[PDB]
Amino acid sequence: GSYNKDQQSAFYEILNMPNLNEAQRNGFIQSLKDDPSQSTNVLGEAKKLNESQA
Amino acid sequence: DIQMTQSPILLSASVGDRVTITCRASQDVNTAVAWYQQRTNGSPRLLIYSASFLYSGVPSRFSGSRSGTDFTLTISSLQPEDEADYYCQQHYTTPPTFGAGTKVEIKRTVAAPSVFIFPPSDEQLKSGTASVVCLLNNFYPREAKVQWKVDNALQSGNSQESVTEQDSKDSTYSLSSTLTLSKADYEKHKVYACEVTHQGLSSPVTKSFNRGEC
Amino acid sequence: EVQLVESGGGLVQPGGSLRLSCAASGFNIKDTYIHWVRQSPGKGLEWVARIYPTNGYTRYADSVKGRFTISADTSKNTAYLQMNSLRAEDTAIYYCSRWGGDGFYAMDYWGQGTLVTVSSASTKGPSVFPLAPSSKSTSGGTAALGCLVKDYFPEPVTVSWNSGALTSGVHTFPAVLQSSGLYSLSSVVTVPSSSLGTQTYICNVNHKPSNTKVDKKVEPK
Amino acid sequence: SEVTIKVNLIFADGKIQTAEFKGTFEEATAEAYRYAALLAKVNGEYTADLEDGGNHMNIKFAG
Numbered sequence A: 001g002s003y004n005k006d007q008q009s010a011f012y013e014i015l016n017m018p019n020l021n022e023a024q025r026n027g028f029i030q031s032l033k034d035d036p037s038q039s040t041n042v043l044g045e046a047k048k049l050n051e052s053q054a
Numbered sequence B: 001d002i003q004m005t006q007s008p009i010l011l012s013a014s015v016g017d018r019v020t021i022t023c024r025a026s027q028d029v030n031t032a033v034a035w036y037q038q039r040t041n042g043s044p045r046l047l048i049y050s051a052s053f054l055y056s057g058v059p060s061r062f063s064g065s066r067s068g069t070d071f072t073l074t075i076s077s078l079q080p081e082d083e084a085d086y087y088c089q090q091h092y093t094t095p096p097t098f099g100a101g102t103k104v105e106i107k108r109t110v111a112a113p114s115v116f117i118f119p120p121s122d123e124q125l126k127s128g129t130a131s132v133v134c135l136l137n138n139f140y141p142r143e144a145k146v147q148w149k150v151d152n153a154l155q156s157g158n159s160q161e162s163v164t165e166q167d168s169k170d171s172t173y174s175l176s177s178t179l180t181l182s183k184a185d186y187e188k189h190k191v192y193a194c195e196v197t198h199q200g201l202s203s204p205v206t207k208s209f210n211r212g213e214c
Numbered sequence C: 001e002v003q004l005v006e007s008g009g010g011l012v013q014p015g016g017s018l019r020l021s022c023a024a025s026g027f028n029i030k031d032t033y034i035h036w037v038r039q040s041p042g043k044g045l046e047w048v049a050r051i052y053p054t055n056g057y058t059r060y061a062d063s064v065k066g067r068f069t070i071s072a073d074t075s076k077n078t079a080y081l082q083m084n085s086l087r088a089e090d091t092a093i094y095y096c097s098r099w100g101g102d103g104f105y106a107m108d109y110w111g112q113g114t115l116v117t118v119s120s121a122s123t124k125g126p127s128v129f130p131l132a133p134s135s136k137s138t139s140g141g142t143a144a145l146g147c148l149v150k151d152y153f154p155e156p157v158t159v160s161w162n163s164g165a166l167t168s169g170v171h172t173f174p175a176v177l178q179s180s181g182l183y184s185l186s187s188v189v190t191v192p193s194s195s196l197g198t199q200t201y202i203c204n205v206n207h208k209p210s211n212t213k214v215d216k217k218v219e220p221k
Numbered sequence D: 001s002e003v004t005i006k007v008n009l010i011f012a013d014g015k016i017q018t019a020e021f022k023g024t025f026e027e028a029t030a031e032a033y034r035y036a037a038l039l040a041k042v043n044g045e046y047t048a049d050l051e052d053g054g055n056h057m058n059i060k061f062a063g
């Protein structure tokens, strides 16, 4: 499917996170595709995990 | 009452040209005349008040003058965003009255339209009517001929046109022609064609589709 | 900033009544004249009435005298137009304006206008259909898509794209009255061909008179 | 009936504008000539060439 500029931005953030491994990166991207209503929540958990793996 | 007679009805000029439009009071109104601009579906904008005074924030290319009962509005260097209706109004006596308006159009180089066609949506086709849309995009001049053919039969009486306001930047027009048929009739025929004749095209352009094609 | 905001316009039957309001801000209507001016669809401007709120002096166009009344409440900085015994020819956008503000003997500020429709016809919300981009709506690497907003009454409808984020290349056509007595229009937008399938395109359609709000996603067929 | 008189306005420097005047044939005629006289004050003496039974004019200004 296609995405608005907001969904694109969440994708971009998770794609660029330096401390995620690729299983985690793609898992979070998959969640963004799964449920757009959860974009903010998903991004927040991705950030927490990225920070904890610094 | 006092009537205000505006002239011309329509004036068309190139970007950078000086244009003058006029307004005549049926009797003395001293200098009690204002000019308004109206465009892009917006409210009237005051340009000039008391015949010759420029309202704050209005570009200096606008000016007004009076000679007896004759009032003029002049635009010294016409810009594309000046395409509009212009109205004069007197307040010398009650009722305050308006001129009937002058429309200013921008003259520019000829541009042939991009011609596109849209079959009825599957969503519309669930119920009983079919709308076919022919789109002519970003062309000049406004004059264009759009004819519908269904299985090569010329259609009449079942289409309507709409045209956009002259574009604020590139001074082009766009036009839609919509053919309306019953769903039953749409499903009975195969070839749907929009034929466009325009000065910018070396010969008429037909845009078409077969019902059912991807 | 000086501002005037009209409200109250809507569909009314012939012989019916409507009340418009004109809310002023950024100045006091006690210091100016307030006018109502109307405009029939596709026609010129016509003065309707005026009031000087400081002393309540009023004047009317002959065509509305006795049927319309203008008034003001300086405590609410608002003017009003009561419209009774309405007729088809009263159909128009009604603007309020000020005159004499800051010493300017002209109408220097106007509201956005409110539409009054006098008709026996009933309110009807639009159907919103996709105009899907296809091989038949693309050339030169750009593609046209849109929404058909069909069969509504009365005017107006508004259309935006992607909640106002998409404005370039948009053409929203003037509504046209169909033989059915219902309005229809299309709004189209031209975008890069390469963006189809990756960028979401949604037309946001609002028909306030029927409380119809539709967000229609438009994608390739 | 209401008629439209179409006018080409041809200025000395080769610039061209077009205008339309509407009303009865006699009103529109009078307005077209009035407008020409007005423009002539700034743009030079005019000449008006009539075509199509007077429904079209070519109005040239001397500069």
Ligand SMILES: OC[C@@H](O)[C@@H](O)CO
Pocket (backbone or CB within 6 Å): B037, B039, B040, B045, B059, B081, B082, B083
């Ligand atoms: O949209 C109104 C603006 O273009 C004018 O005031 C200048 O012509």
